[PDB]
Amino acid sequence: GSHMTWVQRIHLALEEDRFSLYAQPIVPLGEEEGLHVELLLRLRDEGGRLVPPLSFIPAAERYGLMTLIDRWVVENAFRTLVERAQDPRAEPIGTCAINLSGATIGDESFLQFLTELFARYRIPPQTICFEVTETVAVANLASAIRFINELKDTGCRFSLDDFCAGMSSFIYLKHLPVDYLKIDGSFVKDMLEDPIDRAMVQVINHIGHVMGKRTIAEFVETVEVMEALREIGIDYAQGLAIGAPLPFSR
Amino acid sequence: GSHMTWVQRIHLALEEDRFSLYAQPIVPLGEGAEEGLHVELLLRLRDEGGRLVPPLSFIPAAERYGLMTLIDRWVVENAFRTLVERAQDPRAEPIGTCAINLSGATIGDESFLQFLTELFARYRIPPQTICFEVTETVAVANLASAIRFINELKDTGCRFSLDDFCAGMSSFIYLKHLPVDYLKIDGSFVKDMLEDPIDRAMVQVINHIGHVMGKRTIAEFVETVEVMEALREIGIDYAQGLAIGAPLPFSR
Ligand SMILES: [Mg+2]
Ligand SMILES: [Mg+2]
Known part of the structure; x- marks a missing residue:
């Protein structure tokens, strides 16, 4: 569809509350911190059906609309952590991983928006781990270095997912002080059958x-x-x- | 300079024997006494006043005017001739692996296999003695072409290497499709590997x-x-x- 069409669609989905967040648990494998989760975005269309990422993210990113979606994600994530903590039975989240688009890492207004959300929701920055794909970080390296350093000065943590998807040099890594490398799923699925996948995991x-x-x-x-x-x-x-992704946003 | 200028210069250098081959030794690091001396041949050009001409002062012009296949043809013929003369010398150290670098132009040239077949017939070098070498960059920039090339040479019995391995903007995925025998790690990683644990890590990986x-x-x-x-x-x-070991004179 057109520019206008996609602007309307993203705006309308925001307006009708058709985006939602789920939380997938991440379990330690060694010897203890609080609950680790990754937030996952879900979109339902006007007739209630799941929209797979590939049916909206590519169009949104072409028109720079992923800034809007990321801003909604972060606000609603923070709000939900606060409302969650007011239930004394819910176990604290020590690490809440939130994915960000390349458009967001290139947006100089993002740090200010985030700073204000931290102040307003009184979230300890250390509990948030922002996540970008290796590919996106490397394709926009000057942006990613500056982005990650600004946010790290805020006190929060950082992750690269789809790590090693391009089976490339990791020298660049000396410049990104990220905390976690999250292995691309392609390597994990077949690591028991295919010795290249195993080798990549060892690497x-x-x-x-x-x-x-x-x-x-x-x-x-x-x-x-x-x-x-x-x-x-x-x-x-x-x-x-x-463990399955669980509803996170109300 | 002009097209004709560079045609003359390359021809004249061929004519005056001002291109020459040196051989740099490559030592095994592990166990096994299999295979004699391993070397890589290095091309040198001297100008009319006897000074070395650095690669960057002639390779770019040769590439630009399609002269590199001709220089490679000279390299391979002279390498073969030298290997024969060396085999006839009972005092000379036998060569089990002679590595010869080739240009991207040569990987794309379908007349090279026939030229090489003819050199094997005439000089009767055992093909398994020869290891052709192209940079990873050049192989990957021309992947389907490199695969065809490497397989045809392999059927001849020759071995194959990728040098400047992991220099620049590279990926290991291509490697699954390039049936080479050797990877020669770029020197950028090796030089500082004792001080820089990232470079060391990259060598291990x-x-x-x-x-x-x-x-x-x-x-x-x-x-x-x-x-x-x-x-x-x-x-x-x-x-x-x-x-x-430093490079040693190879061609007479
Ligand atoms: Mg992720
Ligand atoms: Mg070489």
Whole structure:
């Protein structure tokens, strides 16, 4: 569709509350901190059906609308953490991972928007871990370095997901002080059958060791794969074998 | 200079024997007495007043005017001729692996396989003695073409290497599709690997993925014995550079 069409669609979905956040648990694999989750965005269309990412994110990102979606995500995430904490039965979240678009890392107004949300929701910055794909960070490196350093001065943590998807040099990493490398799911799914996938997981584990970074495996779909990641020394696991995404935003 | 200027210059240098080959030794780092002396041939050009001409003062012009296939053809013929003369000398150290660099132009040239076939017929070098070498950059920039090239040479019995491995803007995915025998790690990583643990890590990682994908590894620019020892411990297969042996005259 057109520019105008996609601006309306994103605006309308925001207006009708058709975006929602789920929280997927991330479990430690070694020897204890609070609950670790990653927030996942869901969009339902006007007739109530799930819209898969590939049916809206590519169009939104072409028109720079992912700034709007990220701003909604962060506000609603913070609000939900606060409202959640007012239920004394809910267990505290120690790490709440939130994905950001490349458009957001290139937006110089974002730091101010975030600073204000921290003040208003009284969130300890250290509890938030912002997450960008390796690909997006590397394609926009000058932006990512400055972005990550500004946010780190705020006190929050940082993650690269889809890590090693481009099987590239990790030299750039000397300039991004991120805390976590989250292994691309493609490598985890087939690491038991395909020795390249296994090797890539060992490599990532090794970068973690050398750079004092912690690692997370995405797409951990069986307990056998979980066990192999544990043996290698991967720090955390996420996916179908660990626990389902749960409603987070009300 | 002009097209005609560079045609003349390259021809004249060929005519006056001002191109020459040197051989730099490449040492095994691991166990096994299999295979004799491993070398890489290096091209040098001297000008009319006897001074070396650095690569960047002639390769770009040759590439620009499509003269590089001709220079490579000279390199390979002269390498073969020298290997034969060396084999006839009972005192000379036998060569098990002679590595010859080729240009991107040559990987795209379908007349090269026929020229090489003819050189094997005439000079009767055992093909398995030859290892052709192209940079990763050049191979990946022309991937389908490199695959065809490497497989045709492989059917001849020759081996293959990618040098300047992991220089610039590269990915390991391509490697699964390039049936080469050796990866030669770029010297950028090796030079500072004792001081910089990122460079060290990158050497270990390359060695790891290379081994898992069926390749033997070579480190270039090994400048001290301590660097050689560190590469040995990691499991790098071969070393090359100042601590191992300087280039020696090869072509008469
Ligand atoms: Mg993520
Ligand atoms: Mg070479």
